[PDB]
């Protein structure tokens, strides 16, 4: 029993964290085999950030301008190349601690663990989700750029995020490990603002099924709804539209608890209308949207209480 | 910016997790040097049950390697299995006993394999609100101070309300619990006042000031009010401990106590603090300072 926001064990990722220095800028890099991946803005000054021409800044650099430090050991840079918004530093030593890994690009609503690092040293691990507006609500201070997001289903680490910047509202933006930004963001100090955020409906539904599995049913009702009527109501509370894919994805949790997806939708509609009335669901007074259907199946027991 | 429930990086602890099997029971063990520590209920008068076991009855597995048990002894509610191989991944460590209100990271394991890491606090009623399933026994709680791992908790059991109970690494239970199937219940819990205050300072640091007011209270008047909402008493030590956060924000501890009093008697009025509609008590003053400064390990 119990339901916590749980992160993946961070060991396989800790053994890949390095410090990258270029001039006066110091940030984090990910050392996999003989390559160190880091945000390309490490080559910029704060002045450059308004309208940087990365190709022009990079051509002026030599391998010995990039200082890479793995623990107390200096790695020698033997090559460099840019791929989208990520700099790839070829080093003379392969990381002996390189785990089995893949680079995966995630979709909004997907969750992942973040290993927050400063000066190539890990300080903490937390769980978070890619918001529908392509930002993440993280906990990052200056020097955290280059920190990575990942999942470790089975023994393979799936890297899905690298931290690049903080937006004026305090939310965070970054790229996949191929350097493509999530959202319409640029690694430029331009007027950039996160779009209006919405609640991840399929995740709230999954968390309501997790509550039923852990023994709580106070929020259920005798009503059902059509998918269209549910979406007309949900959009009014800034909830993401629920698609037939989401309904299909919630199938296993529906069969385990005996509550049809559109019946759980009717209960969600009622929660939005009435609030919680001094009650909590899984120790929370708000409807939680940072647990996917896959996370619920992984954390909860297979026997409904 | 940002304020998340953050756990310590778990790598140094992952390299110590092993699987311990005795008869039909399989649970987790902590392998430090040539000793494997695990709940003594794996042998299930524990000395009478233990005397009947031989070294070869305990099957210990570290990854895909079988460790040979060469000795065994009991210390309170923990079994210590002497093995023939020292763990090459043993980190710098200490066994520390924590106090209620203190927080720690839990590396949840099943079959000697780590599956997740989360942060939690020792409740005033000595239980923890964790997330564990069958097979999680032997999972450990820890803090990291510089490069040294301080092991503070080993999981033993789940109580009827879904909360968890366990021991320090010397086998002494936290709380009035015993390791056996009997009628045991967690006592009435209370809110960790010094932690709620620390989290209110974290909100001010992150730009949330709607709850601040011009008022201040005495420590005695604050405790008379707090006792009525099942909040732990606030001591002069707690006030002293909150000193650094008070100096950083410019809000005196008794000034923040007056804001907490208004929140208890009036609620949040449809508002949130750090994305929460409840007053959060699982961040210590040290956790707030560490996360709002970036200390590394
Ligand atoms: O935002 C930046 C650097 C930057 C500036 C302009 C554009 C780009 Cl792509 C990157 N660094 C930070 C990251 N996360 C969190 C922070 N918190 C405070 C200060 C700085 C932080
Ligand atoms: Cl995805």
Swiss-Prot record, chain B:
Changing residue 137 to A: Complete loss of 3C-like proteinase nsp5 cleavage. It catalyses: TSAVLQ-|-SGFRK-NH2 and SGVTFQ-|-GKFKK the two peptides corresponding to the two self-cleavage sites of the SARS 3C-like proteinase are the two most reactive peptide substrates. The enzyme exhibits a strong preference for substrates containing Gln at P1 position and Leu at P2 position. Residues 1-297 are cytoplasmic. Changing residue 181 to A: Does not affect ability to cleave and inactivate human TRMT1. There is a cross-link at residues 5, 82 (Glycyl lysine isopeptide (Lys-Gly) (interchain with G-Cter in ubiquitin)). Residues 1-297 form the Peptidase C30 domain. It comes from the Viruses. Inhibited by pyridone-containing alpha-ketoamides compounds 13a and 13b. In turn, alpha-ketoamide 13b (tert-butyl (1-((S)-1-(((S)-4-(benzylamino)-3,4-dioxo-1-((S)-2-oxopyrrolidin-3-yl)butan-2-yl)amino)-3-cyclopropyl-1-oxopropan-2-yl)-2-oxo-1,2-dihydropyridin-3-yl)carbamate) inhibits SARS-CoV-2 replication in human lung cells. Inhibited ex vivo by michael acceptor inhibitor N3. Inhibited ex vivo by compound 11a and 11b. The active site is at 41 (for 3cl-pro activity), 137 (nucleophile). Changing residue 134 to A: Does not affect ability to cleave and inactivate human TRMT1. 3CL-PRO exists as monomer and homodimer. Only the homodimer shows catalytic activity. Interacts with host FBXO22; this interaction promotes the proteasomal degradation of nsp5. Cleaves the C-terminus of replicase polyprotein at 11 sites. Recognizes substrates containing the core sequence [ILMVF]-Q-|-[SGACN]. Cleaves and inactivates human TRMT1, preventing tRNA guanine(26)-dimethylation of tRNAs. May cleave human NLRP1 in lung epithelial cells, thereby activating the NLRP1 inflammasome pathway. May cleave human GSDMD, triggering alternative GSDME-mediated epithelial cell death upon activation of the NLRP1 inflammasome, which may enhance the release interleukins 1B, 6, 16 and 18. Also able to bind an ADP-ribose-1''-phosphate (ADRP). This is 3C-like proteinase nsp5. It comes from Severe acute respiratory syndrome coronavirus 2. The lineage of its organism: Viruses, Riboviria, Orthornavirae, Pisuviricota, Pisoniviricetes. The gene is rep. The chain holds residues 3264 to 3568 of 7096 of the full protein.
